[PDB]
Amino acid sequence: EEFVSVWVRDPRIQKEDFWHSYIDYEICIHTNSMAFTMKTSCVRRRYREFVWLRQRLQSNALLVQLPELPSKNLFFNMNNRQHVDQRRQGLEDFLRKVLQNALLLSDSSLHLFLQSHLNSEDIEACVSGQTKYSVEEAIHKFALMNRRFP
Amino acid sequence: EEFVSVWVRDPRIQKEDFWHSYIDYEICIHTNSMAFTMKTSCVRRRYREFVWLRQRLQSNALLVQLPELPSKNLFFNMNNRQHVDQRRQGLEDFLRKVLQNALLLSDSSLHLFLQSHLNSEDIEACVSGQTKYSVEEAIHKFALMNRRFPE
Ligand code: NA
Ligand code: NA
Ligand code: NA
Ligand code: NA
Ligand code: NA
Ligand code: NA
Ligand code: NA
Ligand code: NA
């Protein structure tokens, strides 16, 4: 009886004592679908990475209508709670809907985004055949790192 | 292409309040097979639960020749590193043989043993259909309790 759930939670500042601080969120997937490699995952990503994802998806799916992202950074201010809640909600909604689409669901880009440590650049490398390691290997390796597996 | 790897590790003495107490071991599965629900799992089980398991598996597969469990039990002294380790070895060997067998691999008692927290009365209840939760529900809740998943 297939299901997929997604939560965006836990807004946290990164590189706070640097110039170039940013915010990121935890993305938690729970699913029983054959579509995913891992039935659970928690991963941390920033808005600019959602933006990358959205555009990568659109580019491989000419005619799909991608859901919206929330307020661009330019109009975001972490000192305003409302901004950080809205950004989180909007990012949850974006993924919820994306996940509802079978065609998108078959994009390994979405999968490494959700169930791996890999950044934009390495995702593109990996799914474009250019890496030592497969998509599965990356996701598995992430899981082990992330669950501190012995 | 498909692997299943099992380790039995990190024995620890656990203390019922008590005069008496026991050792349990950690069991860690890493696989990509469709046979398993969770691609990784860590649970802790004691030797006596392994005993339970072997007899359970035997009764759902009566023509299968089950691997032997290790055999110091009465002798066994939980304060002798060699005792405890000769036993984790044995429990590891037991399971890695067990998992090589597709008949045994389809018993949900083995899966709830490896990938959930349920004890044997509840495993039994659950595979008999006497519990509100399915087999899969239990494995999924264990993963979530155990991966301190947010709600
Ligand atoms: Na959802
Ligand atoms: Na996946
Ligand atoms: Na995730
Ligand atoms: Na658009
Ligand atoms: Na093995
Ligand atoms: Na396990
Ligand atoms: Na399983
Ligand atoms: Na009942």
CATH superfamily of chain A: Phox-like domain
Rg value of chain A: 15 Å
> Helical proportion of chain A?
40-55%
**Helix-strand makeup class of chain A:** alpha+beta
CATH top level of chain A? Alpha Beta
Biggest interface, residues from each chain: A-B, 19 and 20 residues
String of helices and strands of chain A: EEEHHHHHH
Small-molecule binders: sodium ion
Number of β-strand runs of chain A:
3
Gross morphology of chain A:
globular
**Cα end-to-end separation of chain A:** 33 Å
CATH architecture of chain A: 2-Layer Sandwich
How many distinct folded domains of chain A? 1
Strand order of the largest sheet of chain A: 1-2-3
Might you state the CATH topology name of chain A?
PX Domain
The quaternary structure here is homodimer
Number of helical elements of chain A: 6
Percent of sequence in beta strands of chain A: 15-25%
Descriptive notes:
Two copies of one chain form a homodimer. With 150 residues, the first copy, chain A, is α+β, with helices and mostly antiparallel strands. Chain A has a single domain (1-150), classed as PX Domain. The first copy, chain A, has helices at residues 47-60, 81-99, 102-105, 108-115, 120-127, 135-147, and strands at 4-14, 22-31, 40-45. A three-stranded antiparallel β-sheet of chain A has the order 1-2-3. Chain A starts with a strand and ends with a helix. The interface between A and B is medium-sized, with 19 and 20 residues. One sodium ion binds next to α4 of chain A. Chain B: GO terms for molecular function: 1-phosphatidylinositol binding; ATPase binding; phosphatidylinositol phosphate binding. Chain B: Residues 3-120 form the PX domain. Chain B: Interacts with ATP6V1D; may play a role in ciliogenesis.
